[PDB]
Design an enzyme around this catalytic site. Structure first.
Site, PDB file in Angstrom:
ATOM      1  N   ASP A   1       2.413 -23.605  16.040  1.00 32.17           N
ATOM      2  CA  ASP A   1       2.193 -25.022  16.269  1.00 32.17           C
ATOM      3  C   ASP A   1       3.370 -25.816  15.708  1.00 32.17           C
ATOM      4  OD1 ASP A   1       1.378 -24.344  13.633  1.00 32.17           O
ATOM      5  OD2 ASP A   1       0.262 -26.225  13.501  1.00 32.17           O
TER       6      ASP A   1
HETATM    7  C1  LIG Z   1       6.348 -35.443  -4.205  1.00 29.38           C
HETATM    8  C2  LIG Z   1       6.590 -36.164  -2.877  1.00 29.38           C
HETATM    9  C3  LIG Z   1       5.409 -37.027  -2.377  1.00 29.38           C
HETATM   10  C4  LIG Z   1       4.393 -36.281  -1.469  1.00 29.38           C
HETATM   11  C5  LIG Z   1       3.117 -37.081  -1.079  1.00 29.38           C
HETATM   12  C6  LIG Z   1       2.660 -36.956   0.406  1.00 29.38           C
HETATM   13  C7  LIG Z   1       1.116 -36.936   0.649  1.00 29.38           C
HETATM   14  C8  LIG Z   1       0.621 -36.188   1.929  1.00 29.38           C
HETATM   15  C9  LIG Z   1      -0.922 -35.946   2.039  1.00 29.38           C
HETATM   16  C10 LIG Z   1      -1.409 -35.333   3.389  1.00 29.38           C
HETATM   17  C11 LIG Z   1      -1.192 -36.219   4.647  1.00 29.38           C
HETATM   18  C12 LIG Z   1      -2.276 -36.125   5.732  1.00 29.38           C
HETATM   19  O1  LIG Z   1      -3.259 -35.445   5.586  1.00 29.38           O
HETATM   20  S1  LIG Z   1      -2.038 -37.094   7.294  1.00 29.38           S
HETATM   21  C13 LIG Z   1      -3.597 -37.211   8.331  1.00 29.38           C
HETATM   22  C14 LIG Z   1      -3.307 -37.319   9.845  1.00 29.38           C
HETATM   23  N1  LIG Z   1      -4.324 -36.717  10.723  1.00 29.38           N
HETATM   24  C15 LIG Z   1      -4.055 -36.170  11.980  1.00 29.38           C
HETATM   25  O2  LIG Z   1      -2.896 -36.187  12.389  1.00 29.38           O
HETATM   26  C16 LIG Z   1      -5.196 -35.576  12.800  1.00 29.38           C
HETATM   27  C17 LIG Z   1      -4.885 -35.234  14.282  1.00 29.38           C
HETATM   28  N2  LIG Z   1      -3.957 -34.104  14.439  1.00 29.38           N
HETATM   29  C18 LIG Z   1      -2.804 -34.179  15.244  1.00 29.38           C
HETATM   30  O3  LIG Z   1      -2.612 -35.247  15.814  1.00 29.38           O
HETATM   31  C19 LIG Z   1      -1.840 -32.966  15.400  1.00 29.38           C
HETATM   32  O4  LIG Z   1      -2.711 -31.883  15.464  1.00 29.38           O
HETATM   33  C20 LIG Z   1      -0.853 -32.747  14.206  1.00 29.38           C
HETATM   34  C21 LIG Z   1      -1.609 -32.678  12.887  1.00 29.38           C
HETATM   35  C22 LIG Z   1       0.130 -33.906  14.196  1.00 29.38           C
HETATM   36  C23 LIG Z   1      -0.027 -31.377  14.386  1.00 29.38           C
HETATM   37  O5  LIG Z   1       0.302 -31.208  15.661  1.00 29.38           O
HETATM   38  P1  LIG Z   1       1.168 -29.697  16.271  1.00 29.38           P
HETATM   39  O6  LIG Z   1       0.357 -28.612  15.604  1.00 29.38           O
HETATM   40  O7  LIG Z   1       0.970 -29.878  17.752  1.00 29.38           O
HETATM   41  O8  LIG Z   1       2.575 -29.890  15.750  1.00 29.38           O
END
Ligand SMILES: CCCCCCCCCCCC(=O)SCCNC(=O)CCNC(=O)[C@H](O)C(C)(C)COP(=O)(O)O
Ligand SMILES: CCCCCCCCCCCCCCCCCC(=O)OC[C@H](COP(=O)([O-])OCC(O)COP(=O)([O-])OC[C@@H](COC(=O)CCCCCCCCCCCCCCCCC)OC(=O)CCCCCCCCCCCCCCCCC)OC(=O)CCCCCCCCCCCCCCCCC
Ligand SMILES: CCCCCCCCCCCCCCCCC[C@@H](O)O[C@H](CO[C@H](O)CCCCCCCCCCCCCCC)COP(=O)(O)OCC[N+](C)(C)C
Ligand SMILES: CCCCCCCC/C=C\CCCCCCCC(=O)OC[C@H](COP(=O)(O)OCCN)OC(=O)CCCCCCC/C=C\CCCCCCCC
Ligand SMILES: CCCCCCCC/C=C\CCCCCCCC(=O)O[C@H](COC(=O)CCCCCCC/C=C/CCCCCCCC)COP(=O)(O)OCCN
Lengths: 104, 178, 128, 111, 220, 124, 175, 88, 459, 67, 62
Positions: free
Chosen positions: H43
């Protein structure tokens, strides 16, 4: 200009400008050899507080340490010939007041 | 750098870019390879937790609060590759890049040295001069009436055609030109 | 949750922290497509002259000419005597002159009446 | 005449010779960096002698060799102070510059 | 002059201990040592200050040349987070940078020691601003800390650089130049200190704790 | 340090001030005080060009060390006895200054103790 | 050497000590001095000998110009332009000579400060006092004249000072 | 002197090296022409980890817009080659 | 003075009777020869000026100015013959005639014994300059520039004419020697205040004083290259020379009539230097720099000390050389790309290295690097001003910083970075341009060796 | 001296760089030990520091508070 | 050609400078001034043959 995309294919890559695009009134102030408005990790008004506080604290503490110096438990250094009266500018015709030191 | 940009980024592109940025800043915080590898797997998991969300609104709010977290927890001094736009070698060799049209102003005594190079350059110039009009005509053919819509260019399609607007892409100076 | 970042003038707001790019409507997308189209038409117009074999010289840019004209020659035709313009002009124009006059006149009066008193330590001051 | 002044001035004088030779044929060759390095090493070994004179007898000197211009009561002259600070800092700086030029011949090879 | 010098040495030292670029760390070290020279000018010890200028030249130039050999071996990389175990891969550079770090920290019978230990001794025993003295001591500890950061990060541990290993310090130019400054950093302090007339009334009488203050602070 | 703690936090009236010292006469508590002598003449310290802060009561040992360093020049490690002698004279000078400090401190404490307690024996 | 007058540019008798070696080690400074002598000072001396041999063959001289003493600006009547011209030229030449006198005294002061080493504060007091006297006199004569100075303005300055001094002495005599 | 000019062949060997050091890819069935999502069953996040591994490999960073489309090892080889100016 | 003057006049028919293809060669050769002959006025007696005759005299103030004029003529010819190639023979001869008449008027003005002759020649310089600007100027804006240059100048100089004839009626003479020897104090009255203003304002507007300076960006930017060269190098110095001459009859009033002009000059120094930091036109930047430098000269002349007069002379000469060099450097690029905008052509050091060296040296003398004579003049003026009041150092110090800033800004913007991709008509530097730069620069560097020559009468 | 890259392996080392590095490190340590054997005073102090409370008032000249 | 560098870059320039200092610069007063040499008790002057007496019989705290 520092805020623009560096990975884009600009016509003028170091200026980060495209031919025929409207130019900001203050381009020459923002050429990125100069004033930068890029977002910072820490907020403005937080950097200002920390910097001003550090500098004010240092100045206050230096003034305090000026009121409260450090020294050793010693007497003032003694020099032989009327505190070297003729040596530190002389005027050998006016009979300095006798500076005489005693052993201890 | 090489691809024409699009009018906007999709939710998916934003999510992938945030994934990459979070991973790079985490590597900056986690200097050693094993510890970074551990926390990067934890990151991938926390990222996969909301992988299959169908509500676009809640996905957008997840992305937004994730960006807020990244901004609060980013490294103030992330690692940059040396030739990247913040690197210590970013534009180091730009003073050595000379455009090719300068070679036509050379004195004949300078071109006396290097005869073969300049013969082959005359061949390249002939090629460009004989391709230009076909390039212009093709671009006028393949372009909608209301001007182009993106920065994308078509390839060559006929027998001895060249992709339109190729000269300044093919004749780049070099990236270590001296 | 986490402490918030507030923007200012010399440290702007990041794009990922901008609520406007997470509240998208179809009109926003049409605006973005229009902008891209404008950028594209300009890019093609520039690249058609840039790659031209028969073109020798400096491609002329009307945006640059508009910038320099607006910054120099268009300024006076668009000036009006306003309370703001007049007050700012008076301040930034004659304020500093009188400030410096007061400073220098005061200093030199002090020094001269100090010379009249026979009190200045002017020994060795032959060169002036 | 006392050697101390001649050597202290020659130390600084010979450093200008590769600059004079800048327009010369040597500059266009690949022998120029080695030439500058060698010049600096010779300047260092020469400046070592006035340091010995000072460390033996404490010799200090000032040399007002050339009169540049005079404004009524002020005379401006090319003058050199050759006290402890000068004769001690010159060989140190020449030594460090010699090392850093030999280092540059390797570090900056593809420039 | 003393106050300006004291704030500068402490501040630069404080900025240095969190930097990741190796040249930035050594530059902040240079700023800190210049601040120390200004504080020793402030306590009316001009000759002592001059001696430090001569002493510091040797080992700070050597530190920069060592950093440069590292940078060139690692494909123009300057971030210490991508420098792994070079203690074995670059043995001569490691030896030189360790000796330069020991001279910077005032290891006894080294070039750094005559210049810096005397300066700390004179700042301890003079009628001086108390805040300046405290800041000078904290900066003396900071110097040990940043030096430690460079060695720990750049020379110890496992490699963190890309896999195409181009490490090679076998060039006589580099070896000869660094060895020359190395011999300097080891012996110049002793030789120079013993070959000049004494312009300073030496501090012969001080409490033992005060005497060990530079050492105690450095070990901390 | 302890003297600084005593002066800045305790009653500073009971501690000598390094700038204004001594405040008591040099003959106050002593019956007879021999005044400190000099071994080097002004002309000797002028012909040696020592420095104006090196012209203290230890300057004769400094002239010893300087002449001996100039005499045995190439062997820069031969002037050890002379250096030790000058150091020792300087150390004895420093302990004399410390005795002066301590002497001053006790007198101030003693004077305060006697004066205000005769005020005590006068208040009743 | 004898080229310049040692009364205008004096210096003390130049006492230097004799070498008193204390070690068996060889002094590298003296060996370097012999090397320098026999590699540098002898060829240079020979070159100078030849140059002065060629100089002696053709010997010619130049003479310092002497200027008469003409009437000064005090004895010129108010609109007599020729007397005024000659007086002003004379005053300008005297101003130049006074500048050079102050220059000589300053050269003495600087040479003393350098020569006396660590003892300059006591050993150069006479040079300092001499400079003070010369500087005071030069300042009275020419300070505050400004550009566009002239003998008439110098005379007006002197007369103002003389009036002030006379009035001060007169009111001191009433005391 | 510094590193020898890169040759497409060394490039491609290196990309294949990193790709078989990836746990989600079958080594005995990975080819220079294998599609990441389509043939190997990955993916977008796997593909992101793969570009990041490639930058760690070749010591230069790849822009996000360009990467979105490096969907087979041959495309990565072509990108690196055209970026670092290697023709053979 | 006749020996210098007649040959200059001769230059006129020599160019009118020359073959069509030899005008530049002939004019350049004989201009250089005249410059060499003039070089002999630098021998100065000391106590007084050399009085050749009743009509002409040379000074140590005057000698440097004359040599600079005569030396500037051949440089103007070298700079002109490129953009005048398409011109007809008659119009080229007319252009050269304008330059020769200008040189002739200038030489006479500096050496005239009395003020009325000085006034007539100082005003006669207006006609050839105006003709050059308005006839050979490239832009439409030249006509407006010509009007600004004329009217600002005449509005100052006509009260001077009235004041001069009044002064000769009351004193009996305007001869400078008689004026000096028979000088008497100016009382403090309204009549004397207005006489002072009428004697000073013409030279103030020539300098130009800040606030009366608006004609200079127009005229210096819209002029052809030789017009700009002579406007910056020599014509600005008429004000300084005239003020230095005229302030002998103005004492002791100058003590307090100078206050507003000193305030204007110091603050406007800061102002014009700051303006140079945000300038989109490259000639406009060099013009404002000239203004900033002349403000320093105005301060030096107003405080009336020997050190300030020496500094003013040195700064006038050094500015004349440096400003002409900077204008020629800008004109080479303009000839290449046909636009004055500073950010149009960038990274020119990659394409033209020796011209980049000339740029660096001109920028280094503009910011007064020691031991150049620019710094000699600036340092002497700053010391005199310090004596005048210790608070001037703040303004002087600030000005030094802003000057370094905009000088290096210009250098970095035009020479460094990367070249504009589209412009491909930047040909190698011609021998003519390199020789023009060297002939500007070598004399300046040579002057450092013998500082006293440009120091002046006070020295 | 021709050394070629190695790709994920410890680089090739020559005997000369090892011998020189070890020689100079050992030289530094020998110098420090030699100096501390001969000049231990410069680190540990040489002259004793006096204790002011060890001081009688007869040598220090103050009277016993009755005069 | 082995020792050609040390003769044109060290020897020739020191010939010109020593000639220039010995016969031109030191032909005018106060151009090269050397701080006077230190004298110690027991030293012997070279010009006059003077001997400066030694220094007062130290208390000899051996
Ligand atoms: C130390 C530095 C700082 C770090 C802090 C950062 C914090 C991050 C925490 C986590 C962020 C989230 O959960 S962000 C939550 C966002 N939710 C979604 O995106 C649900 C729907 N999924 C999709 O649209 C696709 O499946 C996709 C997932 C794009 C993949 O696609 P491929 O498989 O087709 O590539
Ligand atoms: C101090 C050193 C002493 C050296 C002794 C010998 C010096 C002889 C030089 C004579 C004058 C130089 C002429 C200037 C124009 C340049 C001509 C040219 O185009 O070069 C082509 C030529 C051919 O090279 P190329 O390969 O074909 O390509 C050239 C490229 O264009 C690009 O090549 P590039 O990048 O190499 O650029 C060429 C070069 C040339 O560009 C320059 O800028 C050179 C001019 C220096 C700055 C000028 C303005 C600053 C004000 C100072 C005024 C001093 C003048 C004194 C009198 C001089 C008489 C002429 O630029 C620089 O190198 C950087 C300049 C920075 C200099 C900063 C120094 C500040 C003052 C130093 C001391 C000054 C007082 C001396 C005494 C002090 C008390 C003892 O290149 C050279 O020859 C290099 C020039 C040598 C550098 C000289 C710099 C210092 C000399 C200053 C004056 C000399 C004083 C002598 C008195 C004794 C001491
Ligand atoms: C933008 C650049 C333009 C160029 C700058 C031109 C500068 C010209 C300014 C002239 C400098 C001063 C002029 C006269 C000196 C003093 C002026 C006066 O105000 O001082 C007092 C004068 O008192 C009163 O102020 C009277 C004058 C007030 C009337 C004048 C109107 C001023 C308003 C400002 C208008 C702007 C003028 C410039 C137009 C552009 C002094 O008191 P007093 O001792 O009794 O008079 C001295 C004269 N005596 C001896 C003959 C008696
Ligand atoms: C070169 C190779 C040939 C070698 C043969 C020459 C041997 C020595 C001959 C010396 C020249 C003859 C001579 O001595 O004449 C003196 C003659 C003038 O007398 P001065 O007192 O020095 O000054 C004039 C004002 N009174 O001086 C000379 O011309 C020769 C010495 C000049 C030294 C070279 C110039 C060095 C400085 C260059 C200027 C630097 C910029 C100014 C800096 C100002 C700093 C305050
Ligand atoms: C490009 C802009 C330049 C503008 C310059 C304008 C200012 C010039 C200076 C003043 C101009 C007029 C001065 C008159 C010429 C001097 C003649 C003179 O000194 O005679 C005076 C006469 O003085 C006058 O009459 C002058 C009065 C003013 C009349 C004209 C007014 C014009 C405006 C005046 C103020 C502007 C001056 C400064 C402005 C500077 C430019 C901004 C005394 O003679 P008597 O009459 O005999 O008096 C004693 C015997 N009873």
């Amino acid at each position: 200009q520092q805020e623009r995309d560096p990975w884009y294919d600009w016509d003028h890559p170091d200026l980060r400008l495209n031919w025929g695009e409207p130019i900001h009134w203050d381009l020459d102030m923002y050429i990125r050899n100069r004033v930068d408005t890029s977002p910072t990790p820490v907020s403005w008004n937080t950097m200002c507080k920390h910097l001003f506080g550090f500098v004010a604290f240092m100045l206050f503490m230096f003034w305090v340490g000026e009121i409260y110096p450090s020294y050793q438990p010693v007497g003032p250094k003694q020099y032989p010939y009327n505190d070297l009266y003729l040596e530190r500018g002389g005027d050998p015709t006016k009979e300095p007041e006798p500076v005489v030191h005693y052993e201890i | 750098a090489f691809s024409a940009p699009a009018a906007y980024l999709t939710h998916q592109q934003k999510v992938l870019r945030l994934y990459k940025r979070a991973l790079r800043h985490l590597e900056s915080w986690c200097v050693h390879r094993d510890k970074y590898r551990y926390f990067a797997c934890l990151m991938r998991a926390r990222f996969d937790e909301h992988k299959n969300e169908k509500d676009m609104v809640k996905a957008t709010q997840l992305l937004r609060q994730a960006e807020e977290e990244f901004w609060y927890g980013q490294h103030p001094q992330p690692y940059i590759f040396p030739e990247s736009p913040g690197g210590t070698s970013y534009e180091r060799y730009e003073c050595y890049k000379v455009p090719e049209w300068c070679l036509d102003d050379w004195h004949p005594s300078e071109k006396a040295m290097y005869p073969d190079y300049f013969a082959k350059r005359e061949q390249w110039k002939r090629l460009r001069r004989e391709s230009w009009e076909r390039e212009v005509k093709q671009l006028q053919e393949e372009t909608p009436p209301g001007g182009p819509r993106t920065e994308a260019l078509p390839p060559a399609r006929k027998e001895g055609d060249l992709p339109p607007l190729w000269w300044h892409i093919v004749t780049r100076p070099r990236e270590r030109p001296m | 949750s986490f402490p918030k970042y507030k923007p200012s003038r010399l440290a702007t707001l990041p794009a990922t922290l901008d609520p406007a790019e997470y509240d998208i409507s179809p009109e926003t997308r049409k605006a973005q497509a229009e902008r891209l189209a404008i950028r594209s038409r300009l890019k093609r117009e520039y690249l058609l002259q840039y790659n031209d074999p028969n073109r020798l010289g400096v491609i002329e840019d009307p945006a640059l000419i508009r910038w320099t004209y607006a910054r120099s020659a268009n300024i006076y035709p668009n000036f009006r005597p306003t309370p703001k313009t007049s007050l700012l002009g008076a301040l930034f124009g004659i304020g500093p002159l009188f400030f410096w006059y007061y400073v220098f006149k005061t200093d030199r009066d002090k020094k001269e009446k100090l010379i009249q008193e026979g009190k200045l330590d002017q020994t060795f001051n032959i060169s002036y | 005449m006392n050697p101390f002044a001649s050597l202290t001035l020659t130390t600084l004088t010979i450093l200008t010779i590769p600059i004079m030779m800048s327009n010369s044929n040597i500059y266009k060759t690949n022998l120029y960096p080695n030439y500058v390095k060698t010049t600096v090493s010779y300047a260092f070994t020469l400046s070592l002698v006035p340091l010995l004179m000072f460390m033996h007898t404490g010799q200090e000197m000032i040399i007002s060799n050339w009169h540049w211009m005079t404004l009524q009561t002020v005379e401006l002259s090319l003058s050199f102070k050759m006290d402890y600070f000068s004769v001690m800092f010159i060989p140190v700086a020449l030594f460090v510059t010699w090392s850093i030029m030999e280092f540059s011949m390797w570090y900056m090879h593809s420039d | 002059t003393l106050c300006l010098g004291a704030i500068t040495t402490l501040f630069t030292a404080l900025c240095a201990i969190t930097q990741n670029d190796i040249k930035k760390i050594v530059a902040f070290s240079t700023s800190s040592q210049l601040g120390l020279m200004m504080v020793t000018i402030g306590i009316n010890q001009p000759h002592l200050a001059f001696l430090h200028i001569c002493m510091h030249a040797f080992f700070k130039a050597m530190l920069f040349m060592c950093s440069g050999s590292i940078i060139h071996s690692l494909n123009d990389e300057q971030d210490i987070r991508k420098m792994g175990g070079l203690y074995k891969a670059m043995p001569f550079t490691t030896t030189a940078l360790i000796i330069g770090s020991l001279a910077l920290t005032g290891m006894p019978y080294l070039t750094g020691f005559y210049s810096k230990d005397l300066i700390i001794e004179a700042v301890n025993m003079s009628y001086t601003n108390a805040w300046a003295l405290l800041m000078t001591l904290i900066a003396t500890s900071l110097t040990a800390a940043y030096s430690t950061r460079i060695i720990f990060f750049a020379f110890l541990g496992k490699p963190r650089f890309p896999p195409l290993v181009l490490i090679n310090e076998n060039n006589p130019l580099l070896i000869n130049s660094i060895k020359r400054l190395l011999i300097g950093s080891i012996f110049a302090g002793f030789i120079i200190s013993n070959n000049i007339p004494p312009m300073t009334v030496p501090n012969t009488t001080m409490p033992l704790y005060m005497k060990m203050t530079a050492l105690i602070v450095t070990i901390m | 340090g302890a003297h600084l703690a005593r002066r800045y936090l305790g009653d500073a009236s009971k501690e000598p001030d390094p700038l204004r010292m001594p405040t008591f006469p040099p003959d106050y508590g002593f019956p007879e005080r021999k005044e400190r002598e000099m071994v080097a003449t002004q002309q000797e310290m002028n012909d040696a060009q020592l420095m104006l802060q090196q012209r203290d009561y230890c300057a004769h040992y400094l002239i010893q060390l300087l002449k001996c360093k100039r005499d045995s020049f190439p062997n820069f490690l031969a002037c050890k006895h002379e250096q030790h002698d000058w150091d020792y004279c300087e150390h004895l000078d420093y302990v004399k200054r410390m005795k002066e400090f301590e002497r001053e401190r006790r007198l101030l404490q003693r004077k305060k103790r006697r004066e205000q307690r005769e005020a005590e024996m006068a208040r009743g | 050497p004898d080229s310049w007058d040692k009364d205008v540019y004096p210096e003390p008798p130049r006492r230097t000590p004799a070498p008193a070696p204390q070690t068996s080690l060889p002094n590298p400074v003296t060996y370097l001095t012999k090397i320098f002598d026999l590699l540098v000072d002898r060829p240079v001396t020979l070159a100078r000998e030849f140059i002065e041999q060629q100089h002696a063959k053709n010997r010619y001289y130049y003479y310092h110009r002497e200027f008469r003493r003409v009437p000064d600006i005090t004895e010129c009547e108010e609109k007599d332009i020729l007397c005024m011209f000659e007086a002003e030229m004379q005053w300008r030449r005297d101003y130049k000579v006074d500048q050079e006198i102050v220059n000589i005294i300053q050269e003495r002061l600087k040479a003393c400060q350098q020569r006396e080493g660590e003892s300059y504060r006591q050993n150069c007091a006479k040079e300092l006092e001499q400079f003070t006297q010369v500087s005071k006199a030069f300042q009275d004569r020419y300070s505050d004249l400004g550009a566009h100075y002239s003998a008439r303005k110098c005379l007006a300055k002197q007369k103002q000072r003389m009036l002030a001094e006379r009035k001060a002495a007169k009111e001191a005599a009433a005391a | 002197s510094d590193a020898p000019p890169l040759t497409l062949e060394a490039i491609k060997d290196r990309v294949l090296y990193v790709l078989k050091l990836y746990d989600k890819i079958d080594p005995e069935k990975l080819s220079v022409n294998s599609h990441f999502m389509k043939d190997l069953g990955l993916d977008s996040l796997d593909q992101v980890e793969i570009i990041m591994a490639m930058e760690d490999e070749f010591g230069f960073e790849i822009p996000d817009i360009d990467a979105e489309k490096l969907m087979c090892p041959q495309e990565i080889v072509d990108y690196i080659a055209d970026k670092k100016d290697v023709y053979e | 003075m006749l020996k210098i003057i007649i040959p200059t006049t001769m230059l006129l028919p020599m160019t009118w009777m020359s073959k069509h293809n030899m005008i530049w060669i002939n004019a350049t050769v004989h201009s250089l020869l005249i410059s060499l002959i003039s070089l002999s006025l630098l021998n100065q007696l000391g106590e007084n000026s050399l009085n050749f005759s009743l009509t002409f005299f040379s000074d140590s103030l005057s000698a440097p100015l004359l040599v600079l004029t005569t030396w500037l003529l051949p440089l103007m010819l070298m700079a002109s013959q490129s953009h005048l190639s398409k011109e007809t023979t008659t119009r080229k001869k007319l252009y050269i005639t304008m330059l020769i008449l200008l040189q002739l008027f200038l030489i006479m003005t500096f050496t005239a014994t009395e003020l009325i002759l000085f006034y007539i020649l100082f005003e006669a310089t207006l006609v050839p300059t105006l003709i050059i600007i308005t006839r050979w100027g490239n832009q439409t804006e030249r006509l407006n520039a010509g009007l600004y240059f004329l009217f600002y100048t005449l509005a100052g100089s006509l009260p001077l004419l009235v004041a001069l004839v009044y002064i000769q009626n009351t004193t009996g003479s305007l001869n400078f020697l008689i004026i000096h020897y028979w000088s008497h104090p100016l009382s403090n009255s309204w009549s004397n205040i207005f006489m002072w203003l009428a004697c000073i304002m013409a030279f103030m507007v020539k300098m130009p004083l800040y606030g009366l300076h608006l004609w200079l960006p127009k005229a210096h930017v819209e002029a052809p290259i030789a017009g700009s060269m002579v406007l910056a190098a020599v014509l600005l110095k008429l004000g300084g020379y005239g003020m230095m001459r005229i302030t002998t009859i103005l004492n002791p009033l100058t003590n307090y009539m100078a206050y507003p002009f000193l305030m204007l000059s110091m603050w406007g120094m800061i102002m014009t230097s700051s303006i140079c930091l945000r300038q989109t036109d490259l000639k406009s930047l060099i013009a404002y720099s000239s203004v900033s430098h002349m403000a320093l000269v105005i301060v030096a002349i107003m405080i009336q000390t020997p050190w300030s007069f020496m500094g003013a002379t040195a700064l006038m000469i050094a500015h004349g050389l440096t400003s002409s060099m900077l204008f020629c450097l800008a004109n080479t690029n303009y000839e290449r790309v046909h636009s004055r905008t500073m950010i149009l052509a960038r990274g020119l050091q990659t394409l033209l290295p020796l011209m980049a060296t000339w740029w660096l040296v001109a920028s280094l003398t503009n910011l007064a690097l020691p031991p150049s004579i620019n710094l000699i003049g600036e340092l002497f003026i700053i010391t005199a001003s310090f004596s005048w009041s210790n608070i001037t150092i703040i303004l002087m110090g600030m000005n030094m910083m802003i000057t370094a800033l905009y000088s290096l800004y210009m250098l970095i913007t035009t020479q460094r970075g990367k070249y504009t991709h589209h412009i491909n008509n930047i040909k190698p530097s011609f021998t003519r341009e390199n020789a023009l730069m060297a002939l500007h620069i070598l004399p300046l560097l040579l002057l450092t060796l013998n500082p006293k020559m440009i120091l002046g009468p006070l020295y | 001296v021709h050394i070629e890259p190695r790709y994920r392996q410890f680089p090739q080392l020559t005997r000369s760089q090892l011998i020189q590095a070890e020689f100079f490190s050992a030289t530094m340590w020998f110098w420090i030990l030699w100096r501390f054997w001969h000049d231990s005073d410069a680190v540990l102090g040489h002259f004793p520091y006096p204790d002011p409370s060890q001081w009688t008032d007869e040598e220090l000249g103050i009277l016993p508070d009755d005069e | 050609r082995h020792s050609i560098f040390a003769v044109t870059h060290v020897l020739i320039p020191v010939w010109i400078i020593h000639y220039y200092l010995k016969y031109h610069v030191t032909a005018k007063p106060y151009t090269v001034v050397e701080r006077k040499p230190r004298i110690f008790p027991g030293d012997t002057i070279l010009e006059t043959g003077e001997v400066i007496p030694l220094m007062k019989e130290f208390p000899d705290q051996h």
